[PDB]
Amino acid sequence: FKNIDGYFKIYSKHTPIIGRDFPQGFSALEPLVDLPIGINITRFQTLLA
Amino acid sequence: NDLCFTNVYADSFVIKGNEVSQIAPGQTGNIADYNYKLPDDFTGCVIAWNSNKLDSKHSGNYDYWYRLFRKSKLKPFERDISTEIYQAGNKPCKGKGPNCYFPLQSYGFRPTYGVGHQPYRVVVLSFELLHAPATVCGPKKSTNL
Amino acid sequence: EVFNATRFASVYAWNRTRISNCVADYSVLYNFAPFFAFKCYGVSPTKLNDLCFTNVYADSFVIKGNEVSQIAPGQTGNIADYNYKLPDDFTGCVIAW
Ligand SMILES: *[C@@H]1O[C@H](CO)[C@@H](O)[C@H](O)[C@H]1NC(C)=O
Ligand SMILES: *[C@@H]1O[C@H](CO)[C@@H](O)[C@H](O)[C@H]1NC(C)=O
Ligand SMILES: *[C@@H]1O[C@H](CO)[C@@H](O)[C@H](O)[C@H]1NC(C)=O
Q1: With the C-alpha atoms ordered C39, B25, B75, C26, is the resulting torsion angle positive or negative?
Q2: What are the glycosylated positions (chain A)?
Q3: Coil/strand/helix, residue B15
Q4: C or N terminus of chain B, fewer CB within 10 Å?
């Protein structure tokens, strides 16, 4: 994620990979959505299930 | 009317006469530095028309607001809505009066000022001419490829 | 010597002192007076110490409370019309304590 001039950009690529975790083989990222929020962001948090 | 823009941002606000001259890429002044700042590589339009009929009445009207006291400069296209008293000297003072000043003062408007003090209604239009699926266009023909 | 004065003249005869050939540190103005109106028009009150001025005029006069709000560019009243009129293009600050 990033917030250059608003325009919230989200990139992703799924792969039940090696399964190890942060793997090593190279992997690009395919953007999914790009939506112009244009607000101030400084802190970040994650939700659970 | 013959371009394609990805997205358009319309920012609208009433400012005074000299402030119209102030509003421009990278200008100087307590509006350009603490109230609103356009990016230097701005690609858009600024619109300003006189409004003495909607921002004025008998006995005056002090509804509007503007900031003169900010801890730092204003980054382009960033809002700093907040009511924090400016620090003076080294006092953690929280209040009005001496060396404890309210950041924002009235933009008081009356039907009888000078042109430089008249209630100019300013709206700015921001375009994004980059390589992306555009949204906004004008007249169009759909000749077959 | 303009803020430690003892006989600030009346508004009808506003003493005008000419300030030149000096370095204008505004903390000496900041410490001498517990302000109540330090409104500025042409320049930013935070940004006074980084500018060079060809000349500085300090008009001093003691006046009533509401008349403090009266004193401003483009104003009216018995003082703004007959005693002291601030021009519409004023590049400076006013101080009331
Ligand atoms: C956003 O808010 C944080 C926290 O108040 C502040 O440090 C930062 O300068 C702000 N910036 C923008 C872009 O509004
Ligand atoms: C006048 O000068 C004296 C001596 O420095 C100082 O103590 C006092 O605070 C000053 N008062 C004003 C009003 O400037
Ligand atoms: C300004 O003139 C008045 C006249 O009454 C005087 O009392 C005051 O001391 C003068 N201020 C100066 C010369 O700084």
Answers
A1: negative
A2: 40
A3: strand
A4: C
